[PDB]
Structure formats: C-alpha cells, structure tokens
C-alpha cells in the first residue's frame, strides 16, 4: 500500500533560484556543500528530465550505502519537482519505492515555501516507521540549509 508523509520548511531564498539551485542543480551542489551528507552524485542515464536516473552516494558510517533516484515530473514555471526512490537503501522486499513530490511558492518577503510529499509504497504487510521518516526530512533539512548558506556567499551563482 501506500504511506503519505507531508512537511512545510521555509527558505530565505527566493523560489526560482532556490529552484535552479537546489533542485536543477543537486548533482553538482549536494556533494560541494555536503559532502559530510552526501558523498557523489552519479548521473546513470538521461539528460535530466523524466526518467534520469541517478545514484546518491552516502559517507561512510551512514546507514545505506546509495539509494537510486530517478525523476519523474520537472515543471520550470511552477517550481514542481517529482522524483522515486527506486532502488537501493530502503528498497527491497518491504519498500518498492518512495515517490517524493516537492513545490516550491515564493512568498512576499522573498523567501520561498517547501511543499513536500512522500510517499512509501510497501510491498506486503509492512508499515512505514516514525524513525524513517524522520531521518529523511533531517537529511533534506540539512541539504536545503547547505545550499541556502552556499546561495546566501556566492550572489552571483545562479541568477
Ligand atoms: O523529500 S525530500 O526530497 O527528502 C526533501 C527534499 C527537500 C527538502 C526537504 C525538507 C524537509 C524534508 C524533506 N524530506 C521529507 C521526508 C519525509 C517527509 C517529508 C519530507 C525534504
Ligand atoms: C529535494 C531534496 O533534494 C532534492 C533534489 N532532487 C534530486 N537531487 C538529486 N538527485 C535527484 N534525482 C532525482 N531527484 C533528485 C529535492
């Protein structure tokens, strides 16, 4: 069946570049800003739209080795952004996959709403823990605060 998991999180940041940045850019970002949460970024195949493919590694000591992500939706005017996990991790013969939705809305002050859903869908009598979630919106919170820092130091990386 399937688990809904939705959080909201802020930025000082506005959507568009956080977009561009955080999400477009993720490959090359997470890595240099990150590296003590993601160790590579590898891109399998495909050009960046639905179905790309690629492997997050993570630092030694972690509790998974990789997982592979492919994207699913990228919408540029809405600052939408879908993606699964799809192999590794988590994913075996309890977890076939985790369908994340992320939407990005610029507020008045120019900062930017997180909108994100998760979606775990489990293969037989399994259930979705507290624990597991929570430790995946610790990890989107801390690459968002990395690449938030990063934007803030360098005004003239993607304008
Ligand atoms: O989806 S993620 O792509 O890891 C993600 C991406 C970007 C920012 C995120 C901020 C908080 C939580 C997340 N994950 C999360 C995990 C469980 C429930 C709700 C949100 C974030
Ligand atoms: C939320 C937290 O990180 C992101 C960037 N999305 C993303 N990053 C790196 N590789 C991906 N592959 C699919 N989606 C990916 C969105």
Same mark, same amino acid.
């Given at each position: 069946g399937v688990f809904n998991y939705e959080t909201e999180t802020t930025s000082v940041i506005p959507a568009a570049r956080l977009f561009k940045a955080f999400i477009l850019d993720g490959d090359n970002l997470f890595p240099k800003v990150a590296p003590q949460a993601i160790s590579s970024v590898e891109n399998?195949? $495909?050009? $960046?739209? %639905? $179905?790309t493919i690629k492997k997050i590694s993570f630092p030694e000591?972690?509790?998974?080795k990789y997982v592979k992500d492919r994207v699913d939706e990228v919408d540029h005017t809405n600052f939408k952004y879908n993606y699964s996990v799809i192999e590794? $991790? %988590?994913?075996?013969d309890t977890l076939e996959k985790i369908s994340n939705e992320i939407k990005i809305v610029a507020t008045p002050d120019g900062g930017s709403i997180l909108k994100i859903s998760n979606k775990y869908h489990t293969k037989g009598d399994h259930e979705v823990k507290a624990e597991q979630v929570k430790a995946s919106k610790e990890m989107g919170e801390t690459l968002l605060r990395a690449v938030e820092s990063y934007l803030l130091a360098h005004s003239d990386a993607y304008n």
């Open positions: 399998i195949e $495909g050009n $960046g739209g %639905p $179905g000591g972690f509790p998974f590794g $991790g %988590p994913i075996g």
